[PDB]
């Protein structure tokens, strides 16, 4: 009797126990997020610790069926996921030391505070306090203390920790046969498959970089336009051929330029479409929104929400004694138990969010028949891409007409479209160079290409060169500014934010084709195209059972990441910016400094 | 006169692996899914049979598909098989309100492993450790050795296909013995 026999029957029994322990973890965690009590924190910890103990134990057992000896690729993909390994291969001392470090970092990020150099008793956490300054201030000096203070106080603490964290992760990664921690992380896009659905870890670098050069033009003109307006925002602070002072960019990092919008609004007298007041006047409540989001998905031929989804979801802030976490999320607890937790308000924003989050649930329902270990998006980027596609079509004036949040005789205003596409680019394309540059730095640090003595030096060389952003004050190697961002300090790969953005518009372009949409790529509304929803579902239901390259091909026709749809989405704005910049510089110096 | 209540409205059903059989003999019978294979249910109150066997267990919504002739699955292969020429009805209904509970109810089991498939209407209640590999278990679970039974785990929040369903499988028997089960005629 063959080793694939043993593997199949081992997995058959694991699936039952795993499904059960994992369901108890989901339930206890859900109990916390919808009722924060110290008792519930306890039940959440106790159950989550049971699940991870079970998993690591079973992950060792899964290793006794060598992958070489398995032929059926559905069993093979199951085992690869279970026997995927890390951190156990270290010594027990270094494994314990690593966790001490990851834990030190993660908590000094959520508790370190920085004090205003002029009001010493005003000491502000990031989480409510500095964040409010970096997202709402228009004062150069106020924004500067906050930005610099958080990077001198919280950042410098993390520097020796991050230093040692790099050493241990690389030891772990090479102990598992990867080149470095980065090569380990790029394994999340790897695929081992015949006839050209393979995808090598080094190709992710190849594809990320090649897509990025195509972005540079659109980013250059977005950059030139905001630099112009920001010059007006903060007169005599910004060079017109220079880079952007990092502390003026709209959040704590310049991760999203989206809060810069009211300083640079293209057509000030065409206020952006806001169906909030319509919703309030038609007496819509939270139930109505979600019903409407359900309607949208049926119209493309996807299922209704399960009856459990309506009993067990938490669609409003409970308003009794209970204390909750309001951040919208879409849970797949297991055992076809699907729920959304969201503190819904009657706003146009929460209307779109319900669509975005119900899209997550549709993905979850679609692959529920796959084996347990394969119930995920095709890779780390697919779930959010699918969610965002829904938010896109539901915001269009056409859909808003058909559901009567916009009068039937309403006519779209091309200037109002430019307003909307600018705000979109401030978020969507703004973040792409930020994201690519961060992971490139991280990836290089792990490879050993950047020495310790040049960490912050190459960081800002890359901020200046790639992102067109320049540090307002000089930072030596006493700083660890990349760790002053959550995902770095909390040890999370960052490239998903880049790939899922590119995936999202690949999906939407492919679906609007199928829906025989007429004009430009924004303004598209896949509503009522059962053909489009069905193509979507044919991939959604794959789970992780096929390589993501095949999964992408199932919807768009190529097995490749491709950024041309993103550029196509923004083509209207792209030509508008070009004409707006007839008398602006485009690109940046990389020599100019506020402090020079 | 027929005791269909104590098989349908029974408080505790059996585990599918140890499925229950009740012989119905010498009475009158007055008759969610309800699927018949050898006979028209609409004509049931008119017919007459020597014996009527009432088989009952619980099962997942997923698995109600398997209590039918010519089916394959853990349930049909390893717990309750119906013969290709089955002549009878499979009545099923959702029992979430009854057989699931907030902590999980785990008193319902099905056999997960067996060295061969059951013959039709065979029952197997052995609990011998299942040796999947060359090296023998010694009553000891693990190392390619498994406890043959597996628990269900019904909670009220599960999706429908994971919820408990109560099943009754009525077989109808025509021997040359005097028929003793009927309705009006
Ligand atoms: C999705 O659900 C709705 C209702 O929850 C279904 O619409 C019908 O709604 C009326 C009253 O609202 C009910 O009496 C009907 O039983 C519902 N069902 C049907 C089939 O009309 C809607 O049809 C559901 N969509 C799908 C694809 O099942
Ligand atoms: C896919 O594979 C192509 C063939 O290369 C050979 O096969 C693969 C599976 C490797 O094991 C390699 O060592 C072999 O030489 C590659 O040429 C091609 O670039 C690959 N494509 C991607 C996206 O990885
Ligand atoms: C919330 O938590 C408390 C104790 O942790 C518990 O008594 C209560 O039933 C829980 N649920 C709700 C809905 O309040
Ligand atoms: C018991 O069985 C009969 C079957 O016809 C049904 O009508 C009845 O409602 C069942 N339940 C009770 C509580 O009587």
Author numbering:
A (entry chain A): 19 to 516, 616 to 713
B (entry chain E): 335 to 365, 375 to 528
Reproduce text from the manuscript describing this model.
The overall binding mode of Y453F RBD to mink ACE2 was very similar to that of WT RBD to human ACE2 as evidenced by the low root mean square deviation (RMSD) value of 0.9 Å for the aligned 597 Cα atoms. A surface of 1668 Å2 is buried at the binding interface of Y453F RBD/mink ACE2 and is comprised of 18 residues from Y453 RBD and 18 residues from mink ACE2. Between mink ACE2 and human ACE2, there are differences in five of the amino acids involved in RBD binding: L24 (mink ACE2)/Q24 (human ACE2), E30/D30, Y34/H34, E38/D38 and H354/G354. At the WT RBD/human ACE2 interface, RBD Y453 interacts with H34 of human ACE2 and the change to Tyr, as seen in mink ACE2, results in a bulkier side chain that may increase steric clashes and disfavor the binding of WT RBD to mink ACE2. However, with the mutation to Phe at position 453 in the RBD, the Tyr at position 34 in mink ACE2 does not face the same steric clashes. In addition, while the human ACE2 H34 also has interactions with WT RBD L455 and Q493, mink ACE2 Y34 interacts with residue R403 in addition to L455 and Q493. These differing interactions may account for the enhanced binding of Y453F RBD to mink ACE2.
It has been demonstrated that the interaction of a virus with (a) species-specific receptor(s) is a primary determinant of host tropism and constitutes a major interspecies barrier at the level of viral entry. On 5 November 2020, the Danish public health authorities reported 214 cases of humans infected with mink-associated SARS-CoV-2 variants (miSARS-CoV-2) containing a combination of mutations not previously observed.
